[PDB]
Symmetry: D2
Subunit: 505 residues, 4 copies
Amino acid sequence: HPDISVDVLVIGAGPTGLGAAKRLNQIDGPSWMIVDSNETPGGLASTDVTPEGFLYDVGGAVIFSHYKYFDDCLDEALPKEDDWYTHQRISYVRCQGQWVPYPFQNNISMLPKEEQVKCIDGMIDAALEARVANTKPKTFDEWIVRMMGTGIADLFMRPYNFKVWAVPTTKMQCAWLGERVAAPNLKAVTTNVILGKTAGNWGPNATFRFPARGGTGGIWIAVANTLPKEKTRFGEKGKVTKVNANNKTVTLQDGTTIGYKKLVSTMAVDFLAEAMNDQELVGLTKQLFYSSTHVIGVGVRGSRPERIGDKCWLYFPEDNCPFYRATIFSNYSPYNQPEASAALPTMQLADGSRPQSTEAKEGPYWSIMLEVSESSMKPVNQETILADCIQGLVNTEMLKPTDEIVSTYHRRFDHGYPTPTLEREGTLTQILPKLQDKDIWSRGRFGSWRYEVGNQDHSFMLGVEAVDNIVNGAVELTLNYPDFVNGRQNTERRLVDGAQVFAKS
Amino acid sequence: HPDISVDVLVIGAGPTGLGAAKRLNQIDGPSWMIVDSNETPGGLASTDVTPEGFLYDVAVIFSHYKYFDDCLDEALPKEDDWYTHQRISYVRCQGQWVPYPFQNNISMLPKEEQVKCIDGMIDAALEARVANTKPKTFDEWIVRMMGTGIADLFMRPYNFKVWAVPTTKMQCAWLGERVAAPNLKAVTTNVILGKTAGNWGPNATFRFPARGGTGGIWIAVANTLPKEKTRFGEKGKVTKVNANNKTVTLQDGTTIGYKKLVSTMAVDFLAEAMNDQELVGLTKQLFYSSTHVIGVGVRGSRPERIGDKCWLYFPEDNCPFYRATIFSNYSPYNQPEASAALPTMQLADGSRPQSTEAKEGPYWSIMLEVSESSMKPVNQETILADCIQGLVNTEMLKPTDEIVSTYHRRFDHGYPTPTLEREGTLTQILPKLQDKDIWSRGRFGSWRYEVGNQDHSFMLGVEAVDNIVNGAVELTLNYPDFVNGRQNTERRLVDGAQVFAKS
Amino acid sequence: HPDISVDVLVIGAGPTGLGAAKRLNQIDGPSWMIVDSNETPGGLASTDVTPEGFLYDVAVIFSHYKYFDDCLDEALPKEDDWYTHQRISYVRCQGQWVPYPFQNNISMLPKEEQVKCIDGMIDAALEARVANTKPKTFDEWIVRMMGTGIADLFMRPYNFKVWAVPTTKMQCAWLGERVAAPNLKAVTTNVILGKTAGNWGPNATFRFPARGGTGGIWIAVANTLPKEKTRFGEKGKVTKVNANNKTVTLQDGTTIGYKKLVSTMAVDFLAEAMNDQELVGLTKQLFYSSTHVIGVGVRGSRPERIGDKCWLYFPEDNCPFYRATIFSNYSPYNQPEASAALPTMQLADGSRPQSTEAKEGPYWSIMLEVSESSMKPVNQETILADCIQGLVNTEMLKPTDEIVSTYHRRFDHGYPTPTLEREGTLTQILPKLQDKDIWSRGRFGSWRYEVGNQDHSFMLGVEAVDNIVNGAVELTLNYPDFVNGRQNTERRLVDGAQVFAK
Amino acid sequence: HPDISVDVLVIGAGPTGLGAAKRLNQIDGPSWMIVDSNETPGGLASTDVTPEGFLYDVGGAVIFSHYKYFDDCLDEALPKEDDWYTHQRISYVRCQGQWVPYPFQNNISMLPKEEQVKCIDGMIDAALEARVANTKPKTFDEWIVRMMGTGIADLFMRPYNFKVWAVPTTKMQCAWLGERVAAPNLKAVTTNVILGKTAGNWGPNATFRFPARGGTGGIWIAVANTLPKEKTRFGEKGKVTKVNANNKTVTLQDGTTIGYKKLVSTMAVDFLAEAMNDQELVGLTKQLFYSSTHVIGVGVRGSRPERIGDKCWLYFPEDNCPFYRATIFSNYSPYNQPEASAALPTMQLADGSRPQSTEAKEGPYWSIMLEVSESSMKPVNQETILADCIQGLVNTEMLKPTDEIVSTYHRRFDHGYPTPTLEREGTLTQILPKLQDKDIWSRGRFGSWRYEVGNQDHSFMLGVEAVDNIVNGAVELTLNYPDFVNGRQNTERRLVDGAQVFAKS
Ligand SMILES: O=c1ccn([C@@H]2O[C@H](COP(=O)(O)OP(=O)(O)O)[C@@H](O)[C@H]2O)c(=O)[nH]1
Ligand SMILES: OC[C@@H](O)[C@@H](O)CO
């Protein structure tokens, strides 16, 4: 007999695992517990803070939801109106000295007239071929060309996507992108060129809310707090080291054994295969591809510059900077950085020089958060990436050479993006059903490795729906039908369902 | 305070309501009851029997859901509760029994027609190569799939006889998301090879209850319910629905309070019982056909010309029925034993039998369907005789065949019609009922034919309860293509909830 | 026996008949003569002159044939017999002079219209990508080339004003074999770049006679013929054609016997002169428009707003003419020299001049065309004033401009219409004439507009003779696309036959 | 001064040169003469006769005409009704032991059913692709696949055309084929499959006439006889050895020099370049391609076998025989072979063995004429080709092993077909204008090298039109617009034109 026995064991307390725990806690039938190796729940949605008081999320995380269930849990976790700030998505692409409104491919009107010709010509070619197309594109690259033409592919989509994914567009599938990549309408794009108009409203994150305090990680701390503490085991005491799938036993770092009837595993599936000592699965998971993410944070002295304005996040296809995205993180909340009266010395100027004095001066302060991708196809010099990012900020005119930097941050996250390679689905259909036959629900950004359902709301619901499948026979819609859940308002499942209403009578 | 109070009230014990009841009974959380005005559960999936002992259903099953299978296996668990058959169907066309699907078997038609059919399908294939719109009417869908020549021979005249409306007046989304395009190579190849081939075989089968017909399933399913939570018969006839008070009043005066209502009666009747004039006007804008079911019991061994045929399609105008079923092929117990003695009522040509004496069998049995609507009236007094003449005209019966039993019943609400206007009307009705905590679901509860056969209907009830209790998506109601194109294996009659509770 | 007998008789001394005569005179084998009821050769390519000294043609030459060039160079051999100009043309649209071709220059229009035009051309380009039929009407051809928006702005309303029938009633084979499809990229590129570009330049030119207008060519060409083989004037008016006896009767009673007839008169007149009621019935089923030519002589140096413009198109309804020609740009001698004194007849707004004194020039000159048909009547008594008002409306003239000369003439047979029914009717007429050894050829001799300008017409006559004498294919008559798509260099005014004979 | 001076010199008295001569003689203006190195005019349209009395043409030459002028000249030369025999074209493709009516691609209905499926499937694919085609095919092969589908390409068109052209279909252009290769209508071909019907009437040679005596060569002897004898120079006395294009002088083998003003050269253009000692022209003509043709003749004892019947010519795509075509030459005229009373010994049996008797026996006789192609891409064993053909006749069941052969014939024609290679036009537009600038009209099957206007009537009219261009400024329509002249009735030019009618008064 093992030390602990539960019906459902949840590994991981990021959004996916916390979703599973919330649904298990709501249903309150089968016994359960949740474990994580970090004392602070949140996974890749956690928030760091520099010694100078600048918060940085793991990547430009904004909250936007396809599911009422997710909303219920965030509102339960952070119920006050001043727990949240709402913002319009202000997003731009840096191109040839200009800020081009997102989506690029729908704002060709902003480029020089000569580039407009190249872009529209390519889009005419794509539209004529699309009129007689009877096949689907097989690669991300073919999709880009078929729906945008070469001109826009060469100017933006191809170089940008290598900088994000750390693989070329030719190496990725294209089924994942229904909700991420705008395919442009020839008439709408040409009309806006003729009229000199913009169109910034495309996509599901065109409006968002951001927590007032604690960054994204504050959400998941607050969510986890609603759980019965005795059903949680966070820290080294909850680090999983062995998974014995045949005995349905998990061994923790401190030697605690947990027997389960059903396992919801949200750790990276390649880690799970190793913890299972299952060489067949290790070999299979090693056929998946992922990129690492470097997050760089730069805290700057001064009131928010006019050139920055209300910008939220920014795309950088060009090779004059290492990062693919910048976030004006100080626009998301005033509490992402110190108050104006906080006194801080200048660590360096944006041009790399040292300040003359160690004098601590007051603010106000603003803050830039940058992301750089790394993979076996795209190495990154870890020792210089911070300075290269700051120089990239000067190259893109986001910082003046004289700007005073008062705080820096750099962290590398090994599993950053699960890559939608051409091979992903073929490998996953060998991995996930084999785990399924052992009553292991491997779910999450790296639990099930599908980026298109790898956001905080999708991840949360992957855990929710996994539990719903275990307990109530529910379809795991998010796991297997991203287009289906992304194309509808998912209103049916609530934090208080009929089951709980009728039981309380 | 009302006489009875339950969390969830289910009106109707046809497949839809029994699905709702089966899921409520499985969940065993909220209180509930199910009512029906008929003492026998089954609704429009019941089975009648003539005084001579021939059964007639109002039905072939194909299940898209493990949950449905679980409930049927629970109700009828023994292997000899069922007979399995291949899905053998033919189209009657110009003196020929053409295997279904029609287009793969035009080699049986005269060569001049094969030319016209292939030429039309070539046109459709070339058009499909440059098509960039979806078809808007059932008729356009037919033509794009088949071409003019093949369309005119079968699907156009047959579907008028089925729906009692012309194909140009029906929508086509209810048929699925598949692109309307011909398989030209498959059709020409069979013409070139001079072959026929039906879409059945050892893989393509159905099973049918050994006894009691289709209605036997639903009796057996209903028997698994706690009898005290059921109220079937005149004592369970609903006469008033007060949506504002969440009260139902029965014919005997009993009032039932509910928190959520699952109504499987026809939504136009529901609107009337609600005394909701707005919904009455809206529901009267829906369209439906009535169905005449005709049953004919025949003396004799099964003729060779009938053989293993199961159901048959009739596009041509030499018979009033659109479909015939060799119902005696579904079970030996759909008709009397060979030793049962019965007199001949008439010969197939209408003449009197030579003798009035009762003679022995064996017997076989034909079930026919005729549609009726304001665009296609039916003479109730002569339709039986017209059907029998149609059996002679189609060579299903010889003039000398001995008829030993007849059956004719008219069902007022027979098919909910997928008109062009259906969805515009339903999207005004269903949300107004939903805002009153009324789940109106089923063949005429929600009026969508494509989810109105037995397995879909049952699951409409199951998923309605699952939505009420567990927040499930009602996938069958709103996404028929989605559920039909996948393996619906997740939901079971024993879910994890019940497993974990039992230990 | 008739009064005169020749192997080949030519009726008409416009370009077509003069082509026949030139080839006959070059071959110098079979006997021949040419007649015309006018004392001056040239037909509908003649030139009138107003009493005030302004020339107006009945204009611009593009030659597909070296043979035609040889004859023009023989007739007018000096370099100063001709002036060369670029082919500068514009479409008047919504207050703008839009360079031809219209669709490459819509950037001059309001942005909302550019959107409508480009959207329509996108629709047309996508339909052209899956097209598998040919257009059946001129209208369908226009829409497939241009899209709805651009069609509605120029080619649809303009061609009604030209042909006096709607575009839906005309065939479109007469335009050539080129596929009816848009150049979407070219049109969008000029919109994106905000550019204009006309289809002219240093090598897209035409030449025009220095003196005597277009009519000077045909006088000079006819002068190279042996005078005794010509019969021009009332003495050459044909009044009867007896196709069975192969006899022509002239107005003065002279009878001419022929073995082969090249008739360049209008085929409906020919059927009447033949007293062939069947052919009268068939020819009366052909359709044609009448043409009013209006000329306006203006005092002053050429205004900057006019500039180097040559001819102009008018789709809009603020003027009755479909075409205007800056005829004073074609030659300085199309109008009086600057020292010529002329009184002002009226101002462009219709008012009277302050003085009736004759004042000096210089002068410039506008030539206008208005169409007329049973589907589009024209008031003969007011059309001149309507044209002048149209010149004000289109800003070609300011209200104050001084008009010193006017000209108005109506030509009953102006354009032979490429209706849908034309070919069905012609293929019954021409073979019936051919069986009687009558080659009916020319703008109205054979009624095909696309080979009815000067070089095609001339070559219709040349090729008819070459067919009569040498068994040549009449390529221009039956294969316009063929002759228009090649350099027709083989036939020369001096062929091997004449070289070897000398 | 040269020995002779004429305005127009014609080299060659095949159909092309005789056309030039006939038009020059009709016009009767410029002085002229015609030379040929063979005493018998006719060129590649000549007729040989074996010692046993069997006539064989060069190829399966049959007369079918696009021009009234050509008809006028044939009717003048052979004016009596019994100078000619008229025949329906009975033509078949030997395919898998069966005779499939020509054209093959329109008679799919005759093949085994499994092959009909493959053929119709291929045409369906082609028809759907053709529905969205917006480019023209560039090679003969691409044309075949586009208009016929793979099944018919792989079954017939690809192997037969290699067997004829001695180059693969991928190496040929496709502008030449309008009147040679039937493009199948999908509906017509499918309809005939369904109905079990045939459609053997396609093409300009569905009917033909053949001279009663002397074979095809009898025509050209008779046409040449209408010329004034003193303006002809046929034989070794008329062999051209040097052409001095700069002096406009031709030197004959016997040393005679002829001065000309215009040259109509109908010898092979590569021979002309060699005779000109113009190395530039030699190099260009060597870039042209041609195949050689072997004509094999077999005289057979017996009344015409039932299996042969009224067949005229036959196609052999398969590898059980070396010839691509067989002609039942004895069906063209009874005077192509000896009368029945002629006594001839059996030379061999068709199986190669010696006859039982050497004694001369009577007829009747019939006669087979075979064609085998040769090129640098398709070598041929010259020494065994006669025996290989006879064995192929047995293999194809045209001869029984016991059939008695009474006469054999084999002749190789070095210049047999001018190949429509992809490079042909690019080379010709360098050759023909360069010769044109020297007043040399190089015209004919190998004079101008265009197979699509390489038949007897096209060749004749090339000579006629060259003269008409030299004298009357006529367009050389046949040379430059094969589709134009092949698609119309060329009725305008006659042997008696208006010029001559008016002159005779
Ligand atoms: O059944 C057939 C037989 C021939 N050909 C084509 O017709 C062309 C001309 O062949 P033909 O026998 O008519 O003339 P020849 O080879 O003697 O010049 C050939 O190259 C073939 O590709 C064809 O398409 N289908
Ligand atoms: O000789 C008459 C001939 O050229 C015309 O009929 C062509 O149409």
